[PDB]
Design a protein around this ligand. Structure first.
Ligand SMILES: C[C@H](O)c1nccn1Cc1cc(-c2ccccc2)on1
Ligand SMILES: [Zn+2]
Length: 299
């Protein structure tokens, strides 16, 4: 059987919030079976715990944000994908500030942090949500969908309206593997365009992004002196982003997902729409690693 997993040791990392621009300390600790991913604000008296679920997501404004009343934990998506990517089922996440550190803009620093600390298996079957029939959501020109697949597949397609793209639209379609996630999806940095970036900073918003942790794009070309990590970088990241928001289902998925100019808002939207469609899904666990159609990096 495929067992649930956790962290073998404690990991600490410190950086800044892209949006908040405040220094923050992130500590990851192992948690028990059936726990899931819990975000904790440990600078507050008493400490405020927001479990990472679809129903705790309030704000989808250029970041995924969990809300418990007037306390919020901001920009959760990258870390939750690293954890989705390496298959961390249960871990305690503790923040000194409201927003999670942007690191170098990818899920890469968290992968390197989790790979070094190590994975621990647990005596409990790992629950999966299996997609029985197609579920969809539309919002104007943006679209998102869950469809059956024997494994996990994320396909994506985006109509960026920028000169750098050469009038073309971007498309990537990944088959989920630990190896598949690390080598081709994990290092896809976040991107900023100069038009959107100007109005945020003058208002002391998005003060945290720079060449050091993001892609700063001007009309003429990508200003970062070493260009793109992948030829494919922008669209892969949007895949890095979707994996992180879907994992607020609280369980791993066994279906193909397709996004078309889909964002945080729609990603959270499909989850709730899915859960409501009980006929749409069932829970499944696996007796053998072979029976199971998904391979995670062995502990
Ligand atoms: C935040 C989300 O995970 C993301 N990844 C890539 C792009 N995005 C959207 C996004 C990008 C920015 C941004 C803000 C200021 C500077 C650079 C970038 O803020 N939200
Ligand atoms: Zn992102």
């Amino acid at each position: 059987m495929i067992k649930q997993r956790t962290l073998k040791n404690i990991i600490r990392a410190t950086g800044v919030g892209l949006h908040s621009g405040e220094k923050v300390y992130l500590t990851l600790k192992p948690a028990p079976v059936d726990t899931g991913i819990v975000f904790s604000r440990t600078d507050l008296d008493p400490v405020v715990e927001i479990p990472a679920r679809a129903e705790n997501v309030g704000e989808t404004t250029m970041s995924t944000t969990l809300v418990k009343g007037d306390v919020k934990v901001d920009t959760v998506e990258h870390l939750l994908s690293a954890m989705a990517g390496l298959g961390i089922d249960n871990a305690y996440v503790e923040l000194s500030a409201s927003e999670v550190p942007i690191m170098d803009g990818s899920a890469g620093p968290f992968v390197f942090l989790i790979q070094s600390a190590g994975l621990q298996e647990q005596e409990a079957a790992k629950k999966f949500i299996r997609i029985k029939r197609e579920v969809s959501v539309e919002e104007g020109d943006k679209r998102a969908v869950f469809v059956p697949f024997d494994g996990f597949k994320v396909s994506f397609e985006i109509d960026f309206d920028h000169p750098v793209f050469r009038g073309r639209t971007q498309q990537a379609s990944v088959d989920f593997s630990s190896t598949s996630f690390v080598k081709e999806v994990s290092r896809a940095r976040t991107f900023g365009f100069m038009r959107d970036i100007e109005y945020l900073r003058s208002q002391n918003l998005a003060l945290g992004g720079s060449v050091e942790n993001a892609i700063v794009v001007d009309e003429n070309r990508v200003l970062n002196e070493d260009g793109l990590r992948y030829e494919d970088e922008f669209v892969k990241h949007k895949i890095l982003d979707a994996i992180g928001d879907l994992y607020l289902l609280g369980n791993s998925l066994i279906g193909e997902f397709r996004g078309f100019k889909s964002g945080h808002a729609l990603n959270n939207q499909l989850l709730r729409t899915l859960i409501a469609d009980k006929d749409a899904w069932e829970v499944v666990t696996f007796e053998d690693a072979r029976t199971a159609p998904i391979s995670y990096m062995r502990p």
